[PDB]
Design a protein around this ligand. Structure first.
Ligand SMILES: Nc1ncnc2c1ncn2[C@@H]1O[C@H](COP(=O)(O)OP(=O)(O)OP(O)(O)=S)[C@@H](O)[C@H]1O
Ligand SMILES: [Mg+2]
Lengths: 209, 318
């Protein structure tokens, strides 16, 4: 739901740390042009007097920006219409600031740069735009989709019958694959139940119809 | 005599013991059973020469190694913990903000180690010092129905210009967690009983004595895993000591001899200089508080390279 989510990190490196700590020591030595207070009313003046209006060149630039973001990766799903509407918001805010009341072209790519940098920050290295919208990422979703079919085939060859959870763990985490997490197997069992491929008989055994 | 008595007093009040009568209607209601009060007449409390004396002690006794052993003479070992407790007792002064001059230390320790004894020793010598446990701070409003008083204090406000010895720090609930968090980076506790949003000044130095869960400390396990304290709260502590006991062959023997001698003679086995009076620390804080030792520029340099190399080794270790 957040338009811009900045991942403020303090990763270690001596090059940056030297400057940061020198600037901090400046603060220690400080105590023993900037509108410091004019801005708190300048913001109100811009919020009241200025009513930004977006124009056709800005419209074309925005549509283009969104289509471009999406195609950056199109199987996966990069940006979403909520992000499009948020950009409609950052451009309007940038026009509100500087007191121009018109969303010119420049504000559009300024907001696009901000949005793109934010996405590049808070998404994984192959920027997904879906992990933020869903804990189940594709690199994770493949795990459940493999486990469900492995469970189907496993139970089939067994009947070739059924068992509770412990026995199912015995032939999955041991030799079928690596030491995978246990709850993922019963999670894929839920999808199998929805597909009606297998039936779970209470806490104990579980077979297939 | 008004305003000569306060709740933190032990006094020998002299007065005329008089039968206050229930004059009115509850008078006939009750009868001959009178109520009494003491019309107080005289209150006797019980509870640069000192500067010269403490200066001479500085000349003679080595404060760094003497006051440390003086804090807990009956507690054997853990000298560096006592040295840190001296720093907490004195504390730096950095009131100017842009910060704080309160030193906070936590002793994760181990069950069976005399952390509580150290806390009590600090409480009994530190002015405005209080001792409390996690399970039985905060505040309560309008405790008596009749008088209907407003904004009664707690445990942190009492040690305003002092130290709070929070024993059993791990076993302390979320409400007190938030309260001590507010106190620690605000030096002022507040309440929101009826939208009043009143606040109480509690600039208390925090001395915690949390102990590992599941009994004895596990050195193999990570320190924050051994004690149920969030890293956010622990990381804000100025200095932290993990001081657990190890079964040895000689330390235990000396400890047993010390404790048994205390039991025989009702006095510590005096083997070194053991100052008793706490007024020396009060003189030191009152003296250098106005002085406010100004840091040197070379000091600032050496500490900036100190931070650089500290962060470098922190990375290279991880
Ligand atoms: N170094 C020491 N010198 C003298 N007495 C000690 C020492 N260490 C422990 N004791 C004795 O241990 C007792 C106090 O230990 P505690 O501080 O209660 O241990 P503890 O770790 O606080 O236990 P808890 O409640 O699990 S935190 C007293 O009988 C002390 O005499
Ligand atoms: Mg104890």
């Amino acid at each position: 739901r957040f338009d811009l989510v900045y991942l403020v990190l303090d990763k270690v490196d001596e090059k940056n740390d030297r400057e940061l700590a020198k600037h901090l020591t400046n603060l220690y030595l400080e105590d023993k042009v900037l509108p410091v207070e004019f801005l708190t009313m300048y913001i109100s003046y811009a919020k009241e007097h200025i009513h930004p209006i977006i124009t056709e060149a800005a419209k074309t630039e925005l549509v283009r920006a969104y289509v471009g973001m999406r195609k950056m990766g199109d199987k996966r799903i990069t940006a979403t219409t909520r992000q499009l509407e948020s950009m409609i918001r950052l451009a309007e805010a940038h026009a509100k600031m500087k007191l121009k009341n018109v969303v010119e072209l420049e504000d559009v790519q300024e907001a696009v740069r901000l949005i793109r940098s934010a996405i590049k920050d808070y998404a994984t290295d192959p920027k997904t735009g879906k992990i933020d919208m869903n804990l189940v990422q594709t690199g994770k979703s493949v795990i459940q989709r493999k486990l469900q079919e492995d469970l189907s085939r496993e139970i089939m060859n067994v009947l070739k019958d059924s068992m509770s959870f412990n026995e199912l763990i015995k032939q999955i985490n041991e030799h079928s694959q690596d030491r995978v997490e246990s709850s993922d197997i019963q999670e894929a069992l839920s999808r199998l139940q929805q597909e009606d491929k297998v039936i779970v008989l209470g806490e104990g055994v579980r077979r297939s119809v | 005599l008004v305003r000569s008595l306060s709740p933190g007093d032990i006094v020998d009040v002299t007065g005329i013991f008089l039968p206050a009568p229930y004059t009115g209607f509850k008078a006939l209601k009750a009868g001959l059973l009178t109520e009494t009060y003491l019309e107080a007449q005289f209150v006797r409390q019980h509870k640069s020469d000192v500067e010269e004396r403490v200066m001479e002690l500085i000349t003679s006794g080595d404060v760094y190694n003497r006051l440390a052993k003086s804090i807990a003479p009956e507690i054997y070992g853990n000298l560096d913990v006592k040295k840190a407790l001296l720093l907490l007792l004195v504390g730096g002064v950095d009131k100017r903000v842009g910060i704080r001059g309160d030193i906070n230390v936590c002793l994760m320790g181990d069950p069976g180690v005399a952390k509580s004894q150290l806390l009590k020793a600090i409480c009994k010598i530190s002015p405005r010092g209080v001792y409390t446990t996690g399970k039985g701070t905060a505040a309560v409003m309008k405790d008596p129905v009749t008088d209907e008083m407003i904004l009664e204090g707690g445990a942190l406000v009492l040690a305003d210009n002092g130290i709070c010895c929070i024993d059993e720090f791990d076993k302390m609930d979320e409400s007190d967690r938030t309260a001590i968090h507010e106190v620690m980076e605000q030096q002022t506790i507040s309440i929101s009983k009826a939208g009043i949003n009143t606040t109480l000044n509690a600039r208390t130095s925090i001395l915690a004595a949390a102990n590992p869960l599941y009994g004895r400390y596990n050195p193999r396990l990570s320190p924050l895993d051994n004690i149920n304290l969030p890293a956010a709260l622990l990381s804000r502590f100025d200095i932290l000591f993990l001081m657990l006991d190890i079964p040895s062959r000689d330390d235990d023997e000396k400890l047993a001899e010390h404790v048994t001698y205390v039991h025989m003679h009702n006095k510590q086995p005096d083997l070194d200089f053991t100052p008793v009076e706490p007024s020396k620390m009060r003189e030191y804080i009152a003296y250098a508080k106005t002085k406010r030792p100004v840091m040197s520029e070379a000091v600032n340099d050496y500490v900036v390279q100190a931070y650089i190399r500290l962060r470098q080794d922190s990375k290279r270790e991880m």
